[PDB]
Amino acid sequence: MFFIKDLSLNITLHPSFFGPRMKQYLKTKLLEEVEGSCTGKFGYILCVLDYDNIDIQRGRILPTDGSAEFNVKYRAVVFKPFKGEVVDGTVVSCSQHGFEVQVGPMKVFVTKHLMPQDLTFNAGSNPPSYQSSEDVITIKSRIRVKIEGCISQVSSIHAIGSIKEDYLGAI
Amino acid sequence: KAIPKDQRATTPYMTKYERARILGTRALQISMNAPVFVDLEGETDPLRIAMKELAEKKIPLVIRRYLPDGSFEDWSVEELIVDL
Amino acid sequence: STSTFQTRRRRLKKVEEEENAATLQLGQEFQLKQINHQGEEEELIALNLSEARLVIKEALVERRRAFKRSQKKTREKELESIDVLLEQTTGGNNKDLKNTMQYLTNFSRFRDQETVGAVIQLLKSTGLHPFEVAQLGSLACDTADEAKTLIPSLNNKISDDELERILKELSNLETLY
Amino acid sequence: VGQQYSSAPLRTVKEVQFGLFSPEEVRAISVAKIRFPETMDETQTRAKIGGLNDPRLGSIDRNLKCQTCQEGMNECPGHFGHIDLAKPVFHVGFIAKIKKVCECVCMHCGKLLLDEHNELMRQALAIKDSKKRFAAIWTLCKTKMVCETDVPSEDDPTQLVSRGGCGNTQPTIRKDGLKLVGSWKDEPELRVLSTEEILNIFKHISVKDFTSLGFNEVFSRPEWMILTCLPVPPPPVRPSISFNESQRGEDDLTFKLADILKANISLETLEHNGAPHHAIEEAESLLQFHVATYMDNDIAGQPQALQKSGRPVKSIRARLKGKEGRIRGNLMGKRVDFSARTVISGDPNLELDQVGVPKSIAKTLTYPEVVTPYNIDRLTQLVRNGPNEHPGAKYVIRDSGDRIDLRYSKRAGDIQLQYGWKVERHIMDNDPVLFNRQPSLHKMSMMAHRVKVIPYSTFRLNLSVTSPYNADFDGDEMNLHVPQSEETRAELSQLCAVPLQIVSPQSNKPCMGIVQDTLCGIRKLTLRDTFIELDQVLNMLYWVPDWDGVI
Amino acid sequence: AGRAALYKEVYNVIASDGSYVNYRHMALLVDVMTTQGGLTSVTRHGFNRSNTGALMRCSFEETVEILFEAGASAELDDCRGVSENVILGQMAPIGTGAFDVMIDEESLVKYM
Amino acid sequence: LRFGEMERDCMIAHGAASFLKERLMEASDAFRVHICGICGLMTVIAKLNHNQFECKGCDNKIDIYQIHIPYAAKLLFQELMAMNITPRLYTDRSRDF
Amino acid sequence: RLVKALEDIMVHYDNTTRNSLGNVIQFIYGEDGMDAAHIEKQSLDTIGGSDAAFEKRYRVDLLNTDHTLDPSLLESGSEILGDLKLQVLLDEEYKQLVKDRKFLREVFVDGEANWPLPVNIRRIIQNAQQTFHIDHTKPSDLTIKDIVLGVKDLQENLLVLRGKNEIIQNAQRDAVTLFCCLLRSRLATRRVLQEYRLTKQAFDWVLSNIEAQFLRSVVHPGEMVGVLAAQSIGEPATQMTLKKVTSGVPRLKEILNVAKNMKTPSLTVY
RNA sequence: CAGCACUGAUUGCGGUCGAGGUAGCUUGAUG
Ligand SMILES: [Mg+2]
Numbered sequence A: 001m002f003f004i005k006d007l008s009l010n011i012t013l014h015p016s017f018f019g020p021r022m023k024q025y026l027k028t029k030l031l032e033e034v035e036g037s038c039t040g041k042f043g044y045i046l047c048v049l050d051y052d053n054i055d056i057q058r059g060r061i062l063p064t065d066g067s068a069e070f071n072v073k074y075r076a077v078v079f080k081p082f083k084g085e086v087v088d089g090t091v092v093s094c095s096q097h098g099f100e101v102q103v104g105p106m107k108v109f110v111t112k113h114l115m116p117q118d119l120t121f122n123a124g125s126n127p128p129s130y131q132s133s134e135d136v137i138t139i140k141s142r143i144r145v146k147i148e149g150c151i152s153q154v155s156s157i158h159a160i161g162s163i164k165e166d167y168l169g170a171i
Numbered sequence B: 001k002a003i004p005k006d007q008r009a010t011t012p013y014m015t016k017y018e019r020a021r022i023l024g025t026r027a028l029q030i031s032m033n034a035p036v037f038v039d040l041e042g043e044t045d046p047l048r049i050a051m052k053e054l055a056e057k058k059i060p061l062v063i064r065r066y067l068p069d070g071s072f073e074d075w076s077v078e079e080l081i082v083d084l
Numbered sequence C: 001s002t003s004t005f006q007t008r009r010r011r012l013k014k015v016e017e018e019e020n021a022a023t024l025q026l027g028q029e030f031q032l033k034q035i036n037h038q039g040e041e042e043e044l045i046a047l048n049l050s051e052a053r054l055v056i057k058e059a060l061v062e063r064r065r066a067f068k069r070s071q072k073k074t075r076e077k078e079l080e081s082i083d084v085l086l087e088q089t090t091g092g093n094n095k096d097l098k099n100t101m102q103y104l105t106n107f108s109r110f111r112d113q114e115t116v117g118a119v120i121q122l123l124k125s126t127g128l129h130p131f132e133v134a135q136l137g138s139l140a141c142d143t144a145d146e147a148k149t150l151i152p153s154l155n156n157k158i159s160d161d162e163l164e165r166i167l168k169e170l171s172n173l174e175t176l177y
Numbered sequence D: 001v002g003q004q005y006s007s008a009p010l011r012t013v014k015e016v017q018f019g020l021f022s023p024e025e026v027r028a029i030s031v032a033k034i035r036f037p038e039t040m041d042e043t044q045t046r047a048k049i050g051g052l053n054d055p056r057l058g059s060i061d062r063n064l065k066c067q068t069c070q071e072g073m074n075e076c077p078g079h080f081g082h083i084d085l086a087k088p089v090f091h092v093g094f095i096a097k098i099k100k101v102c103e104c105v106c107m108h109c110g111k112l113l114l115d116e117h118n119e120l121m122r123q124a125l126a127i128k129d130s131k132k133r134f135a136a137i138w139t140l141c142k143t144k145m146v147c148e149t150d151v152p153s154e155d156d157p158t159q160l161v162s163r164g165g166c167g168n169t170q171p172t173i174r175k176d177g178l179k180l181v182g183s184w185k186d187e188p189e190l191r192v193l194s195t196e197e198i199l200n201i202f203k204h205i206s207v208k209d210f211t212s213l214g215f216n217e218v219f220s221r222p223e224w225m226i227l228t229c230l231p232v233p234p235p236p237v238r239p240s241i242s243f244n245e246s247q248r249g250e251d252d253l254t255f256k257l258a259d260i261l262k263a264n265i266s267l268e269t270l271e272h273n274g275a276p277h278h279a280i281e282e283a284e285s286l287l288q289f290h291v292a293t294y295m296d297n298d299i300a301g302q303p304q305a306l307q308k309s310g311r312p313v314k315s316i317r318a319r320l321k322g323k324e325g326r327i328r329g330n331l332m333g334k335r336v337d338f339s340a341r342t343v344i345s346g347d348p349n350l351e352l353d354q355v356g357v358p359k360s361i362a363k364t365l366t367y368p369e370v371v372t373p374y375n376i377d378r379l380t381q382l383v384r385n386g387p388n389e390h391p392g393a394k395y396v397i398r399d400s401g402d403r404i405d406l407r408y409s410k411r412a413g414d415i416q417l418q419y420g421w422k423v424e425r426h427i428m429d430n431d432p433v434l435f436n437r438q439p440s441l442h443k444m445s446m447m448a449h450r451v452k453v454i455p456y457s458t459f460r461l462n463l464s465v466t467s468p469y470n471a472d473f474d475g476d477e478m479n480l481h482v483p484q485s486e487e488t489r490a491e492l493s494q495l496c497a498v499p500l501q502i503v504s505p506q507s508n509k510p511c512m513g514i515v516q517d518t519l520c521g522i523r524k525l526t527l528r529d530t531f532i533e534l535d536q537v538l539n540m541l542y543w544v545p546d547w548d549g550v551i
Numbered sequence E: 001a002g003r004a005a006l007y008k009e010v011y012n013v014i015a016s017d018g019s020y021v022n023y024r025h026m027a028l029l030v031d032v033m034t035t036q037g038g039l040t041s042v043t044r045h046g047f048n049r050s051n052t053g054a055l056m057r058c059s060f061e062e063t064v065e066i067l068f069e070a071g072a073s074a075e076l077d078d079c080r081g082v083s084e085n086v087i088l089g090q091m092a093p094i095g096t097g098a099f100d101v102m103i104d105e106e107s108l109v110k111y112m
Numbered sequence F: 001l002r003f004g005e006m007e008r009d010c011m012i013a014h015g016a017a018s019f020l021k022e023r024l025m026e027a028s029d030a031f032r033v034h035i036c037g038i039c040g041l042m043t044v045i046a047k048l049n050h051n052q053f054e055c056k057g058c059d060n061k062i063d064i065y066q067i068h069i070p071y072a073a074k075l076l077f078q079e080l081m082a083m084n085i086t087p088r089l090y091t092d093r094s095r096d097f
Numbered sequence G: 001r002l003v004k005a006l007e008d009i010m011v012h013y014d015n016t017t018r019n020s021l022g023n024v025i026q027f028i029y030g031e032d033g034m035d036a037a038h039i040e041k042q043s044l045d046t047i048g049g050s051d052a053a054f055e056k057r058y059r060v061d062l063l064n065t066d067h068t069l070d071p072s073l074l075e076s077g078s079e080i081l082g083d084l085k086l087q088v089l090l091d092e093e094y095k096q097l098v099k100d101r102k103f104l105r106e107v108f109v110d111g112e113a114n115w116p117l118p119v120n121i122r123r124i125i126q127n128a129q130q131t132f133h134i135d136h137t138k139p140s141d142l143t144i145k146d147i148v149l150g151v152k153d154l155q156e157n158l159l160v161l162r163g164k165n166e167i168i169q170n171a172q173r174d175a176v177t178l179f180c181c182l183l184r185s186r187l188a189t190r191r192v193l194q195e196y197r198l199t200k201q202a203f204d205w206v207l208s209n210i211e212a213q214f215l216r217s218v219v220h221p222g223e224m225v226g227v228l229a230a231q232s233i234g235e236p237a238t239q240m241t242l243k244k245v246t247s248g249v250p251r252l253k254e255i256l257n258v259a260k261n262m263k264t265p266s267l268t269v270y
Numbered sequence H: 001c002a003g004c005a006c007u008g009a010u011u012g013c014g015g016u017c018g019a020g021g022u023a024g025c026u027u028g029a030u031g
C-alpha cells in the first residue's frame, strides 16, 4: 500500500529573500507546504525523502513585482487507501454504532451492521465494547479491516470497513 | 527543447532591450529591499545601484533567449558584453 | 498542489474516471508504468510496513545530520527514540507523521535492513504487481486461502503450493520481538 | 488587483479555444431558472423575484449574496442563468452556414452528396484548412440536386457501384427573411423548411462528415448553430441604474430578454390549448424574431425592432462593433489614470530631455515609492509636509492593504513609515515621464522627459524637440502619462528618452535640429565681419555650463 | 518581378514629394504583400483573412462577424499576437519581452 | 485621458513592453477572475474565504486557476457567451510550434 | 491599415524577420541586418571614373621604376623594388578591386556611388589622422604584408549571422559583400600610403573601430520592425500637400487596394 | 467632425469622405 511517488511543487519567492542562502529557505518552504498535506489525488504526503539533492533548477522572475517562481522537483513518501484494501490497525473509539479503528495517519470506521451477527454491542461496558461468544473488541485490541469504501475530505481521508468477511476480526 | 552552452548561436552582446530590462528588474528588486551585491559608494536611488551592479557584472541573473521554433539559449549577465 | 509527472490533454470531456478496488485498478496516478523525473520509465514503488519505517527514518535522520552540516556557521523503545528524532526535524504540526510512526513502528514485521533485503529478493521473482508484493510482505499469513483471500488479486496468478512456501519462509525470517 | 487573497495559483493565458455552447452545458452552468419576465417588485415590494435578474445570479443594492459567494459587487463577476426556449430557433448570425449546410447535405438521411468515388471530390477533401475545405465542398454540392444511389467507380463508366441511398430530390434553397425555403422540381412545389426539421437533419450528421465540413467533434457540432437553451448574462453585463430609489433604470438588454421571455410563454400556452395549426407559426416567428434581434439588430430585412421612444435598441453585436465599442474601443485603447493635458509653450532654458510641469499638475499626479532604508528619512518628510506644500505626498499605504488619506486622517501629522509600505508622493524634478502630442504616427510622437516643476499653468518644452511631436504654440494641447513601477520607468528612461531619439531610422538621419531664433542667430554671430568684445565674451563663456574656466 | 515592380511603384509615390524613406521599410511592406502567392491587399479583403489568430483580425473592420465564424469552427489562438495579449492585459513578446529573465542561484553565491 | 490605438501602436514600436502592460492594466481595467482547468470559462464560484471552489457542470474543486485580465475583456467574454460563443481560457499550450 | 497589417512582425534572435506565425518575411531584416539608425551616405569610389584614373589610383607594380612606391612612402620601400614574392599579393589586391568594379556596375547601373551603408569610414580615418599627429613628410613603417593582410583579417570579423555551418556561414558573405567593397575601396594599399600617410599604430587603430563600430551597427533581436515600417510609410503620407499622370495620396490608395482599374495605365518601351 | 438636443447626452437625430446599386438604398471610414 504505502507509496513513494515523485512529485514537484512551485513556490513564489519575494525579492527580499534573494540572499546567499536562498536555496536553504526554499527547501524549508517546500517542507512546511507539503509535509502533512492531503489530497485525493495523492493521499497523505508524510515525509520528503532524500533531503540533500532537492532540485530547484533556475528560477524565473515574474514580471510586475520582483518575485521569482521556482519549480521544486522533490520526492516523498505517501499513503493513500483503497476500497477493497486490507489493512490492520488500533481501535480508538466505540459506540452504539460501531467502533473506529486507526490504520496509520488514517482512520477506518466500522458500522454495527457491517460486522458479525453474533457480536453484540455492550452499553454499560467501560470502556465501551462489543462482545462475542469468544471475542472481546474494545479500546486497545488490534483488529484488521477491509476498506469497503474511501471518502476524501478537506485535509484527510476516511473509510467504512467491514470485518464480516472471513479471516478478518481481531488477532 | 533547450540548447547546450556550446553550439550557442545568438549575439554575444546584450540587446538594448535586455539590458534595459535587466536594469529595470534588478532595480525593482533592489527597491523591494532585495540584497545588493556591490559596495554602495553611497548611492541611494535603486536604478543607480542597478547600473553599478551591471557595471561590475555582479547581477545574478540569466537571459533566456527564445527562438522562433520554441527552443532557447541561456546567457548570463556575466557572459554578455555590455558595449552600447 | 504538487503535479504528478504526467500531462494528459484534458480536452473538456473529463468523464470516464473508473472505480477503485484491489482489482489492481488504482487511479490514473499509480500505473505500474510510471515516469521518473530523469525522463525514463520506472516501476511503481510499493512500500510495505516496516520497509517504510526504515526509509522514513533513514532519510529522516540524514536530514538531522545535514540539518547540522549547516549549523556550525525494541517495541516500547524505538517508540521514544523516534519521538525525539521527529521533534528535531519535523514541522511539529505534523500530527499525521507522528501517528504514522507509532503505527509504522508497532505493526512492522521486520527490523534489519538485511532481513528486509531478503524479504525483497525473496518476494521479487513472483512477477506480482508491486501492490501485492507489499501487502504480501506486511500481512501475517499462514494459508494460501488466507492470503489469496485478503489479497484477491492473486487467485490465478500464483500456485497455492509455492505461495505457501513463500509465506512459510516469511514467518521464518520474521524477526522476533 | 481586485484585492483579497486567493489561495489559488496564478498563471497567464496562453491558448484561447473558441467554440459554441451546447444546450446541455448552458444548463449545467446556470444557477437560475429565470421563469418570470418581471424585474423584481414582489408585488411592488423591493427586492427581486426568483425570476429575472437574481433568481440567484449576480447582485444589486450593494449587498453581499452572490450565491453565498458574497464578496459583493466589486469582486463577484457574473453568474450565468438560462431560459429553456419552447421551440428551436436559428442564431441570427449563423443562419448563412445552416443554409450553406443543408445545401451540402441532403435531408431525410443526412449524409454527404459526394464521396471519394467522385474524382473532382477527392482533390477537395485533401485541402487541409477547414476554411477552404468548405468553400470547396459547398461549391460542389449546391449544383448536385439529386441524392444519387449508385456511381460508376474508377473502372468502366459501364460498371455501376453502390453506397448509401434515398434519392429524394435536393431542393434548391433561398433565404426569405429569417427562414428557409426550397422548391422540388411538370411545375414546382414550394414548402417551408421548419426549424425543428433542420435541427434533426443536423443531429444525424456523421462524425467523419462533421470534420470533412469545417467543424470540431467536441467544441462545435453543427447541431448547435440552432439554439435550444438560452444563457442569461448576469446583471454586471446589463447593470441596472437607479435614480436614487423609487425609480427604474433597466438596461436595454434586460428588456429584450424580458421580451423574449414574454414572447416565449405565449408560444407555449398555445401548444397546450386552442392550437389552430397555422396560427402558431405566426407567434413562433415572434420568438425567432426577438431572439434574433437581441443579438443582431441591423438586419437587412428592414424592420429594426424598435423600442418605445423609437430608439432602435442595442443588439449585443452593436457593443463590439467598430470603434467606440468594446474591442476596438475598450480593449485596444483605454481611458487611464495618471494622465494630464494642457497647453504647450516654448522655453529656451530647459535642456532637451526636460519638460516643464506646472505645480498644479505636479501636485496632483503621483508616484508610489516603497519605504526602504535608503529613504525612510526623505520619505517621512514628505508624508509630514502633507499634500498642499509642493514637495510632498498624498497617500500612505500599509502592507495590510488599506489606504491612509493624508488630507484627512487624524494621524496625518503622526505616522512612522514601515520598511515595505508604499508612499504615493508628488512627482518631483527628474521623475521620468512619457510626454506626447496627437496624432501619434511616429515612434517619436511619444517621448520621455525629465520632470522639472515650474509655475504658471503650461507644459514647457525645448524648441528643438518641437518638430518631432510636430507642434507649434498657437494654443496646441499636449499629453503626459506618469510611470508607476521602478521597472516601468527604466523602460522609458532606457529606450524612450529623447537623447536617444536624436537619430531617426525612418530616414537614417537625425530628426532634430536648431530652429527659429537660435538658428537665424547662430549665423549672424558666425560671419567673419562679426566681433565681440571682452565685457561680453566673458558673459558668453559663463553661460556655457561646461566651460573649462579658461578664457 | 512583381515585388520589384510594386516596390518601384511605391517608392515613386514618396519620391515625388522629396520625402525620403530607407529601403527596408517599403521593402518590408512590399514583401509582406508579396510573400504568400502574389498580390495580397492591405485591406479587409486580404491581409485580414490569413491564418493570423482570431482575436487579432478581430480588431479591425469585421469584429463580431469574425468571432462568430471563429467559435463555429472552433479556432485556436497562439497568443503570439501583440494585439492578442493587449486584449488580455499581459506583457507581449515585444522587445523588452522577447525573452525571459532568471536568478541563477549558483552564481548568486560567488557574489559575496 | 485616452491611450488610443495609435498610442498603443507607438509603445509597441519602442518595444516598451512592460510600460504598455502598465497603461493597459494597472492604470485602468485590471481585474481578476477565477477559471477552470477544463471548461475554460469564468464559471468558478470562488468563495475566497473558506476557499471552496467548484465549476459544477465541469464539476471541479481541484484544478482551478486565477488570472489577471482587463475587466473590459472579462465583459467581452461574458458578452460573447450570451451570444452563445465559448472563449476558452487555458493556461498551458498543447499545440506547441 | 499599414499598421494593423504589420503589427506582429519583428526581428528574431536568429536575425530573421518574421511575423506571428513564424513565417519568414525576410531572412535578414533589410537584407543586411543593419539598424536604420547606424547608416550614412557613403560614396563607392571603386565605381566611377575613367579606366585610366583607376589605374593611377589603386595600381601598384613593384616591378617598374615608375609604378612602385617611392621610398619616401613605405620606410622599407627601396628594398622592395623588384621583390617578386610580394607582387603576388600586391597583384591579388588589384585583381580584386577590379572584380569589385564590375560587380558594383551590375548592381547600380546608374553608376550612382553614394549609398546608405554603416560605419562611416571616411571620418574614422580623419580622426585616426589628427589623433596621432601624422606628418605627411616622414615615411611609414607598414609592411606591404601588414596592410594587405590585416584588411583581410578584418573582413573576417564583421559578423552579422553567427551560425556554425555552410548554409549560414554562406549567407554571412552575402550580408556583408557590399560593405567590403567599400572597405577594400578605402583601404587600398596605394591609398593607405600616398593619400593618407598612416603609421602601423594608426592603421591598426582604424581597423579596430571599423570592426567595433560595425558590430554596433547591427540590428537588435527585439525591434518591432513591422510597426516601425508602417508608421515610416504612413507619417510621410500626411505631409503630402498638393509630368501628367496619377500620382500622390490617391495613387498610394490605388496601390494598397490592388485595384485593377488605375486612372493611369501607361507603360514604357525601349 | 456642419449643426440640434426632440426619446435615455457614460447618446439619439443628423452631417462629410469612400464603396457598393434596378433603384423609390446598405453601410466601411468617420466628433
Ligand atoms: Mg496648430
Ligand SMILES: [Zn+2]
Pocket: D058, D065, D066, D067, D069, D070, D076, D077, D079
Ligand atoms: Zn457571486
Ligand SMILES: [Zn+2]
Pocket: D106, D107, D108, D109, D110, D111, D147, D165, D166, D167
Ligand atoms: Zn439521403
Ligand SMILES: [Zn+2]
Pocket: F035, F036, F037, F038, F039, F043, F044, F054, F055, F056, F057, F058, F059, F060
Ligand atoms: Zn469548470
